[PDB]
């Protein structure tokens, strides 16, 4: 009927100080640290349709296939836990916990047939 909570969701989920408000966590963009001369990491980029943050990627996500299910196609999912610490207010350390919504909103998957 009229959902895609947007125009207040974000602002919403910062807002509300993110007390279980945030079914808009997709993958828009990735950041793999697998490069020479650099240590292991996974940092993404994840967002609501406005705000960007890319700060928590630290969960299960080292997994194999997980790389493209935590975002195969910009899947939304509404985190429910995560470890959110600053390192200095500067590099900020965000872990993610789980997924509360399609989880798998790639868009493009969805099989159906059978």
Known sequence: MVGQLSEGAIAAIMQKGDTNIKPILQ???I???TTGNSPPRYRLLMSDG???????MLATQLNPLVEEEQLSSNC??????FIVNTL???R?????????????????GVKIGN
Do not use: W, Y
Request: aromatic share 2%; charged share 25%; proline share 3%.
């Open 92 to 108: 900020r350390v965000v872990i993610l916990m789980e997924l509360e919504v399609l989880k798998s909103a790639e868009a493009v």
């Open 50 to 56: 406005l705000n960007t943050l890319s700060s928590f």
């Open 27 to 29: 993958v828009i963009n």
């Open 88 to 90: 200095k207010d500067g």
């Open 31 to 33: 950041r793999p640290i």
């Open 76 to 81: 939304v999912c509404q985190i429910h836990r």
